[PDB]
From a paper:
Within the protein lysine methyltransferase (PKMT) family of enzymes, one branch contains five enzymes that share two highly conserved, functional domains: the catalytic SET domain and the MYND domain; these five enzymes are known as SMYD1, [name], [name], SMYD4 and SMYD5. Among the SMYD enzymes, [name] and [name] have been implicated as targets for a variety of cancer indications. In the current study we exemplify pharmacophore series for [name] and [name] that show low nanomolar potency against their targets and significant selectivity over all other enzymes tested with favorable physicochemical properties and pharmacological tractability. S2 Table Crystallographic data collection and refinement statistics for [name] and [name] crystal structures.
[name] is an inhibitor of [name] that was optimized from an initial hit from Epizyme’s proprietary histone methyltransferase-biased library using a radiometric assay with tritiated SAM and an H3 peptide as substrates. [name] inhibits the enzymatic activity of [name] with a potency of 3.9 nM and is noncompetitive with respect to peptide substrate and either noncompetitive or uncompetitive with respect to SAM. Instead, SAM dependence was tested by measuring IC50 values at two SAM concentrations differing by 10-fold; the resulting IC50 values were similar, inconsistent with a competitive mechanism. The binding mode suggested by enzyme kinetics is consistent with the crystal structure of the ternary SAM-[name]- [name] complex. The cyclopropyl triazole moiety occupies the lysine channel with the amide carboxyl group hydrogen-bonding to the backbone amide NH of Thr185 and the azetidine nitrogen interacting with the side chain of Glu187; both amino acids are also engaged in hydrogen bonding interactions with peptide substrates. Compared to all other published [name] inhibitors, [name] binds in a distinct and unique manner, traversing the peptide binding site and inducing a pocket into which the hydrophobic tail of the molecule is inserted. (A) Two molecules of [name] (molecule 1 = cyan; molecule 2 = purple) were seen in the peptide binding site of [name] (green). SAM (yellow) is show in stick representation. The dissociation constant (KD) was determined to be 5 nM, with a kon = 5 x 105 M-1s-1 and koff = 0.003 s-1. Western blot analysis of intracellular levels of BTF3me1 as a function of [name] concentration demonstrated a concentration-dependent inhibition of this mark with an IC50 of 2.9 nM.
Residue numbers in the entry: -5 to 432
Write the structure that this text describes.
């Protein structure tokens, strides 16, 4: 049977497009799907490898490897072999000669980069692609009438950078069209991360962007090279709408919704946002002899929201040693009122694990991830990729310090989850099983 189901997935069989009352257009099933089933795949309509990963990944197929070959002309684009080089040429052409001309003045933002490739795919290929079997880039929603003279000013920067760096092999539409398009990208664009959650690049998957949002989703989006796959994490029955999450589901219901309104212009009405069952445990209060009063909680919460924004902006400025102090002390304050499973505590613990890893303090980074994992399993849903990568980190750290048994446990915990989300076939599942076997 295995042959037929790959074909069905590739063609989006057993699914359809419809109008979701109160959510524009959307996607629903016309057959049952069990937990771990592949629904559909969607090859990338446009993509770009992030600048800081050149030399580690091939630009065309995203394979991670050593001994890639360098572009003879510009020396700033790498490939598996000559086949991958030829296939990337229609796109790489947009930057090759310019990178040589501008030297080190060449710094277009990743948003500009990806939009240039969209424009170039439209001259070459005006008609409907295999990425667009149910929704087309042309049809993408913009939220143009909801924007303001902060946002609209930000786009006009990108429009200028596009004209400045790309005029040579693109001809541009009128300003009105470019503003709409840059808004469409924001509403429909995807990021790609690796198994440790480092940024790799950006891309457009049109069929994938038909699906609407829920904080208790029933599918999950994973990557295989530049290809997107979609697998179920709850049982789905005929006539039922198919939902992803668009955001990190760790945080409480207020925090989630500020983000959704800001980036996507809507308010979620799902069961977790209605009942708010998990909010109380995400903001778990210390149980002291004289237990903390109500105003003393509103204090530590607003302090915590701000020490996250301070740290966000401090990543571009400061020393590693100074950032690790900012985490230590911010935890040290919060621990009087908040328990160790409070998500605002867990936030700073994660950032501190990041700082310890760049410093190669592997024992120091290990007891952060030890305190993280059990709370992460409680707050997140079943089959969460966030939970899976943290196990993965623990597995690797344990084995770096020669403690085989606890490392093998943590690696199998990660594989258990990945089987459901990435499928049993996945290249990652092999790569981890070779860490086991040595
Ligand atoms: O950009 C979006 N999502 C990106 C967040 N990325 C999460 C992700 C996936 N795989 N991995 C890598 C990964 C691989 C192996 C493990 Cl064990 C762990 C991790 C990260 C996907 C997005 C865009 N929208 C548009 C529709 C509004 N919604 N979400
Ligand atoms: O929900 C969170 N992140 C989600 C937003 N991320 C995906 C994303 C990004 N951009 N775009 C739109 C976009 C993508 C590519 C280009 Cl070229 C253009 C546009 C999607 C994932 C989140 C992050 N945190 C941090 C505090 C820990 N908390 N929640
Ligand atoms: C990537 S799109 C999804 C496709 C969209 N329905 C369309 O066809 O234009 C994101 C947009 O869909 C809408 N949307 C997604 N999930 C929603 C929800 N749970 N409630 C209301 N609107 C939602 C929002 O308007 C959001 O900006
Ligand atoms: Zn390649
Ligand atoms: Zn080149
Ligand atoms: Zn919700």
């Amino acid at each position: 049977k295995d042959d037929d189901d790959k074909m069905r997935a590739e063609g989006l069989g057993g699914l359809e497009r419809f109008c979701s009352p109160g959510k524009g257009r959307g996607l629903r099933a016309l057959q049952p799907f069990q937990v771990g089933d592949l629904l559909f795949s969607c090859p990338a309509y446009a993509y770009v490898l992030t600048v800081n990963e050149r030399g580690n990944h091939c630009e065309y197929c995203f394979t991670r490897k050593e001994g890639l070959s360098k572009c003879g002309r510009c020396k700033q684009a790498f490939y598996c072999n000559v086949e991958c080089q030829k296939e990337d040429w229609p796109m790489h052409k947009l930057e090759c000669s310019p990178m040589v001309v501008f030297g080190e003045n060449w710094n277009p933002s990743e948003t500009v980069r990806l939009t240039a490739r969209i424009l170039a795919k439209q001259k070459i290929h005006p008609e409907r692609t295999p990425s667009e079997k149910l929704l087309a880039v042309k049809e993408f929603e913009s939220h143009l009438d909801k924007l303001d003279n902060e946002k609209k000013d930000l786009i006009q920067s990108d429009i200028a950078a596009l004209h400045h760096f790309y005029s040579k092999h693109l001809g541009f539409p009128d300003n009105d069209s470019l503003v709409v398009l840059f808004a469409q990208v924001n509403c429909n664009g995807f990021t790609i991360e690796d198994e440790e959650l480092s940024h790799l690049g950006s891309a457009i998957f049109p069929d994938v962007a038909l699906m609407n949002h829920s904080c208790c989703p029933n599918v999950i989006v994973t990557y295989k090279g530049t290809l997107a796959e979609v697998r179920a994490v709850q049982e789905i029955k005929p006539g039922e709408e198919v939902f992803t999450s668009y955001i990190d589901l760790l945080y409480p219901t207020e925090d989630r919704n500020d983000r959704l309104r800001d980036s996507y212009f809507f308010t979620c009405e799902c069961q977790e946002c209605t009942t708010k069952d998990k909010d109380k445990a995400k903001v778990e209060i210390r149980k002291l002899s004289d237990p903390p009063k109500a105003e003393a909680i509103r204090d530590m919460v607003r302090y915590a929201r701000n020490v996250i924004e301070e740290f966000r902006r401090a990543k571009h400025y400061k020393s590693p040693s100074e950032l690790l102090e900012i985490c230590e002390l911010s935890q040290e304050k919060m621990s009087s009122v908040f328990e160790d499973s409070n998500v605002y505590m867990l936030h700073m613990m994660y950032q501190a694990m990041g700082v310890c890893l760049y410093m190669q303090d592997w024992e120091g980074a290990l007891q952060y991830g030890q305190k993280i994992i059990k709370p992460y399993s409680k707050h997140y849903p079943l089959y969460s990729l966030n939970v899976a990568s943290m196990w993965l980190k623990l597995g690797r750290l344990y084995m770096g310090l020669e403690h085989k048994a606890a490392g093998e446990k943590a690696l199998k915990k990660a594989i258990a989850i990945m089987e459901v989300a990435h499928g049993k076939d996945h290249p990652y599942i092999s790569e981890i099983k070779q860490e086991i076997e040595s």
